[PDB]
Design a protein around this motif. Structure first.
Motif, PDB file in Angstrom:
ATOM      1  N   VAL A 321      -6.999  26.720  53.435  1.00 24.17           N
ATOM      2  CA  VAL A 321      -7.844  25.825  53.160  1.00 24.17           C
ATOM      3  C   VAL A 321      -7.471  24.867  52.776  1.00 24.17           C
ATOM      4  CG1 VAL A 321      -9.946  25.998  52.013  1.00 24.17           C
ATOM      5  CG2 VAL A 321      -9.375  28.421  52.793  1.00 24.17           C
ATOM      6  N   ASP A 322      -8.184  23.502  53.092  1.00 30.32           N
ATOM      7  CA  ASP A 322      -7.703  22.590  52.308  1.00 30.32           C
ATOM      8  C   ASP A 322      -8.530  22.119  51.072  1.00 30.32           C
ATOM      9  OD1 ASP A 322      -9.655  22.242  54.485  1.00 30.32           O
ATOM     10  OD2 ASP A 322      -9.041  19.632  54.025  1.00 30.32           O
ATOM     11  N   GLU A 327     -12.534  19.850  46.771  1.00 31.85           N
ATOM     12  CA  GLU A 327     -12.409  18.215  46.849  1.00 31.85           C
ATOM     13  C   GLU A 327     -13.492  17.677  46.255  1.00 31.85           C
ATOM     14  OE1 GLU A 327      -9.195  16.300  47.497  1.00 31.85           O
ATOM     15  OE2 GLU A 327      -7.603  17.556  46.034  1.00 31.85           O
ATOM     16  N   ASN A 328     -14.181  17.734  47.986  1.00 33.97           N
ATOM     17  CA  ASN A 328     -15.776  17.434  48.554  1.00 33.97           C
ATOM     18  C   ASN A 328     -16.716  17.848  48.038  1.00 33.97           C
ATOM     19  OD1 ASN A 328     -14.320  17.028  51.571  1.00 33.97           O
ATOM     20  ND2 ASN A 328     -14.351  15.846  50.002  1.00 33.97           N
ATOM     21  N   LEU A 544     -11.860   9.481  21.491  1.00 35.52           N
ATOM     22  CA  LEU A 544     -12.939  10.143  21.715  1.00 35.52           C
ATOM     23  C   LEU A 544     -12.269   9.749  23.453  1.00 35.52           C
ATOM     24  CD1 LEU A 544     -15.403  10.152  22.359  1.00 35.52           C
ATOM     25  CD2 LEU A 544     -15.949   8.149  22.959  1.00 35.52           C
ATOM     26  N   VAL A 545     -12.068  11.251  23.416  1.00 37.73           N
ATOM     27  CA  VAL A 545     -10.880  11.750  24.724  1.00 37.73           C
ATOM     28  C   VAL A 545     -11.912  11.777  25.798  1.00 37.73           C
ATOM     29  CG1 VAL A 545      -9.419  12.728  25.802  1.00 37.73           C
ATOM     30  CG2 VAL A 545      -9.314  12.265  22.896  1.00 37.73           C
ATOM     31  N   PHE A 546     -12.224  10.616  27.622  1.00 41.16           N
ATOM     32  CA  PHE A 546     -12.291  11.521  28.687  1.00 41.16           C
ATOM     33  C   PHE A 546     -11.506  12.042  29.490  1.00 41.16           C
ATOM     34  CE2 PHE A 546     -16.278  10.190  28.267  1.00 41.16           C
ATOM     35  CZ  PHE A 546     -17.032   8.947  26.284  1.00 41.16           C
ATOM     36  N   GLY A 547     -11.653  13.342  30.111  1.00 44.47           N
ATOM     37  CA  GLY A 547      -9.886  13.403  31.337  1.00 44.47           C
ATOM     38  C   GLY A 547     -11.100  12.414  32.362  1.00 44.47           C
ATOM     39  N   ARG A 548     -11.023  12.513  33.250  1.00 40.09           N
ATOM     40  CA  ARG A 548     -11.093  12.316  35.007  1.00 40.09           C
ATOM     41  C   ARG A 548     -11.426  13.859  35.127  1.00 40.09           C
ATOM     42  NH1 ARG A 548      -7.834   7.795  38.104  1.00 40.09           N
ATOM     43  NH2 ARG A 548      -6.835  10.038  39.696  1.00 40.09           N
ATOM     44  N   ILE A 549     -11.961  14.178  35.781  1.00 38.10           N
ATOM     45  CA  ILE A 549     -12.772  15.257  36.737  1.00 38.10           C
ATOM     46  C   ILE A 549     -12.217  15.017  37.941  1.00 38.10           C
ATOM     47  CG2 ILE A 549     -14.422  16.624  37.499  1.00 38.10           C
ATOM     48  CD1 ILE A 549     -16.058  15.652  35.400  1.00 38.10           C
ATOM     49  N   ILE A 550     -12.889  13.952  38.897  1.00 37.09           N
ATOM     50  CA  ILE A 550     -11.843  13.352  40.015  1.00 37.09           C
ATOM     51  C   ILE A 550     -12.330  12.647  40.489  1.00 37.09           C
ATOM     52  CG2 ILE A 550     -14.341  13.700  41.463  1.00 37.09           C
ATOM     53  CD1 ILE A 550     -12.199  15.223  43.087  1.00 37.09           C
ATOM     54  N   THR A 551     -11.224  11.717  41.137  1.00 38.52           N
ATOM     55  CA  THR A 551     -11.410  10.367  42.222  1.00 38.52           C
ATOM     56  C   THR A 551     -13.411  10.369  42.396  1.00 38.52           C
ATOM     57  OG1 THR A 551     -10.987  10.887  43.781  1.00 38.52           O
ATOM     58  CG2 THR A 551      -9.211  10.160  42.231  1.00 38.52           C
ATOM     59  N   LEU A 552     -13.847   8.452  42.766  1.00 43.31           N
ATOM     60  CA  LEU A 552     -14.495   8.313  43.915  1.00 43.31           C
ATOM     61  C   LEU A 552     -14.839   9.029  45.222  1.00 43.31           C
ATOM     62  CD1 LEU A 552     -16.262   5.346  42.163  1.00 43.31           C
ATOM     63  CD2 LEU A 552     -16.542   7.450  41.513  1.00 43.31           C
ATOM     64  N   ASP A 554     -11.591  10.043  48.469  1.00 43.30           N
ATOM     65  CA  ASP A 554     -10.660  11.194  48.880  1.00 43.30           C
ATOM     66  C   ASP A 554      -9.177  10.446  48.605  1.00 43.30           C
ATOM     67  OD1 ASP A 554      -8.181  12.290  50.385  1.00 43.30           O
ATOM     68  OD2 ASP A 554      -9.073  13.771  50.661  1.00 43.30           O
ATOM     69  N   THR A 555      -7.812  10.155  48.280  1.00 43.14           N
ATOM     70  CA  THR A 555      -6.822   9.532  48.588  1.00 43.14           C
ATOM     71  C   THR A 555      -5.795   9.884  48.920  1.00 43.14           C
ATOM     72  OG1 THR A 555      -7.396   8.455  46.551  1.00 43.14           O
ATOM     73  CG2 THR A 555      -5.490   8.211  47.250  1.00 43.14           C
ATOM     74  N   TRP A 556      -5.725  11.100  49.737  1.00 43.35           N
ATOM     75  CA  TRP A 556      -4.568  11.338  50.162  1.00 43.35           C
ATOM     76  C   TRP A 556      -4.597  11.083  51.866  1.00 43.35           C
ATOM     77  CZ3 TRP A 556      -0.178  14.270  47.448  1.00 43.35           C
ATOM     78  CH2 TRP A 556      -0.046  14.300  46.137  1.00 43.35           C
TER      79      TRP A 556
END
Length: 556
Positions: A321-322, A327-328, A544-552, A554-556
């Motif tokens: 599975v890709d 991600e989507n 105050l630490v924010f983690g990025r869950i995912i980019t807006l 697909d970048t691949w």
């Protein structure tokens, strides 16, 4: 409401059985081995077992297959129960420890012995394999295959008591040493292992092999449809042989479905341990890791994980599975749950020279398309509940000193650059157009500050950018993650560190609008033009630490 489980071969087997009254209720189970943390690779099977029981109003059992004393650990039992509950599985009161049934397996073993269906083998381990044969040379009985019931019962008892060393004796099913399926050639049922068990302590010196305990546990639990992967096809002959020799009625049946490996992902425990040992990752819950713990910390929602698993097809063929589907699913679930806010990750100061006196803007948390597709015509409010879209707004201070993203100002712009340039203009999100009147540069060539003028009605601009008040914004650390691995098959299609994505973790220090200060700790946001973020839950709990869950996108 769409079906929890789309029609698949297992689904059809069940409807066929309910139709013929083969079983009163459907009973399924997910039996992980508590030898490591639950990970993305367990999602498909566990949800298939759970959703199947649910779809047919059956019972779902969660079982810790802790029959191997050297691998079972309390820490994995604890994490697995916790992670699967987080995912949404519901087993109610049906939580089982296979070790709690060591006595039951032993009694079945004695029954098999008394029926002349099992014997204690005492030949060397190398001999056992030699006598076993091949598909071109039938097996030969050792001199112990014909031991009496009395003798086998006595030796098994002493094996259990620990009187003999590991590998000195084994209990074997008495089946057929000439069968073409190697698994039917007197498979081992018990092995001696003089090691304590994290739960039974020093109670047992013999532990049941997988082919013996698995079918029995299924039978003891009342499982009706036992689901496993294709690798256990041949094992089904032993599974059936056991259900029959022991006369279970009703009896469970085993059905195998193809594996569904996720691409760009490695779930092998020994390999993930090396990454932790070598420090390429902070630990087992590092957001880049495939464990459910890491996904929970990354900020992924259980709803998204289930929607991903639901989209995966069920068949008797192994397939990959890709991650794009995963991600989507994450991005799509956050679209309706993450109110939009502004944060500047690589801040550059800009002074609005003709602005005296802070202005309070009231900007909406949600885009029209989100409001439009709202099931109840209402929308979310961080902290509050749901409200009319008109109410889903917050105060955004527009002050003399601001911060804009460094990449949104370019002294030497490429053709078609739509943002801020020297002497140029840009629109500040929800606030109007400004013109860059001046700016300074340090020795390294980085712009240190910008002086601009807020323009009037006639002004035009080719672009729009986010921004935050330099005086009212809260400083923050942002953690940006990327896929741990850079190729679809870091392990091969059947040294893996040459495939680690470079800069999979990047830390930036910037600012977030103040409206965020009041929100609940688990609030998830879309930082405009940057991605989806949320407070790293682990760093919240620390001393105050924010983690990025995912980019807006697909970048691949």
């Amino acid at each position: 409401a769409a079906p929890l489980v789309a029609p698949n071969f297992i689904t059809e087997i069940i409807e066929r059985d309910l139709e013929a009254g083969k079983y009163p209720r459907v009973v399924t189970r997910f039996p992980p081995d508590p030898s490591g943390y639950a990970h993305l690779g367990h999602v498909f099977a566990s949800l298939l077992d759970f959703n199947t029981a649910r779809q047919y109003g059956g019972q779902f059992n969660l079982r810790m297959d802790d029959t191997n004393p050297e691998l079972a650990r309390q820490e994995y039992v604890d994490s697995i129960a916790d992670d699967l509950k987080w995912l949404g599985l519901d087993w109610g009161e049906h939580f089982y420890y296979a070790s709690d049934y060591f006595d039951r397996y032993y009694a079945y073993a004695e029954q098999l012995i008394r029926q002349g269906d099992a014997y204690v083998e005492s030949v060397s381990p190398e001999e056992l394999s030699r006598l076993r044969g091949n598909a071109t040379t039938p097996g030969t009985p050792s001199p112990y295959r014909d031991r009496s019931v009395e003798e086998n019962l006595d030796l098994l008892r002493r094996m259990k008591a620990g009187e003999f060393a590991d590998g000195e004796h084994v209990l074997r099913a008495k089946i057929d040493l000439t069968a073409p399926n190697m698994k039917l050639r007197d498979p081992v049922l018990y092995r001696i292992v003089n090691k304590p068990h994290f739960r039974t302590s020093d109670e047992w010196h013999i532990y049941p092999a997988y082919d013996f305990e698995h079918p029995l546990q299924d039978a003891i639990e009342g499982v009706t449809h036992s689901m496993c992967s294709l690798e256990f096809v041949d094992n089904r002959a032993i599974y059936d042989w056991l259900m029959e020799k022991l006369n279970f009625d009703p009896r469970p049946h085993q059905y195998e479905f193809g594996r569904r490996g996720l691409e760009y992902t490695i779930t092998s425990k020994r390999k993930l341990r090396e990454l932790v040992q070598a420090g390429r990752v902070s630990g087992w819950d590092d957001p880049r890791m495939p464990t459910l713990r890491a996904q929970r910390r990354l900020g992924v929602t259980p709803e998204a994980v289930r929607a991903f698993a639901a989209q995966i097809g069920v068949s008797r063929t192994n397939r990959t599975v890709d991650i794009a589907v995963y991600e989507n699913a994450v991005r799509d679930d956050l679209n309706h749950r993450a109110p939009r806010v502004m944060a500047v990750l690589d801040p550059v100061k800009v002074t609005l020279t003709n602005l005296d006196g802070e202005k309070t803007l009231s900007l909406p948390y949600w885009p029209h398309d989100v409001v439009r597709d709202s099931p109840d015509g209402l929308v979310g409010m961080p902290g509050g509940g749901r409200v009319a879209p008109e109410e889903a707004v917050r105060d955004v201070p527009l002050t003399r000193e601001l911060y804009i993203e460094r990449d949104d100002f370019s002294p030497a712009p490429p053709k078609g650059f739509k943002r801020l340039t020297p002497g140029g203009t840009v629109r500040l999100r929800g606030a109007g157009i400004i013109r860059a009147d001046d700016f300074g540069t340090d020795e390294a060539g980085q712009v240190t500050h910008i002086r601009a003028t807020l323009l009037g009605e006639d002004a035009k601009a080719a672009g729009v950018i986010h921004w935050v008040s330099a005086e009212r914004a809260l400083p923050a650390e942002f953690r940006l993650y990327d896929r741990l691995f850079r190729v679809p098959h870091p392990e091969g299609e059947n040294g893996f560190m040459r495939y680690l994505t470079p800069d999979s973790l990047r830390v930036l220090r910037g600012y977030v609008e103040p409206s965020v200060a009041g929100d609940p700790a688990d609030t998830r946001y879309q930082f405009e033009r940057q991605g989806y973020f949320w407070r790293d839950p682990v760093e919240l709990e620390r001393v105050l630490v924010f983690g990025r869950i995912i980019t807006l996108k697909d970048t691949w």
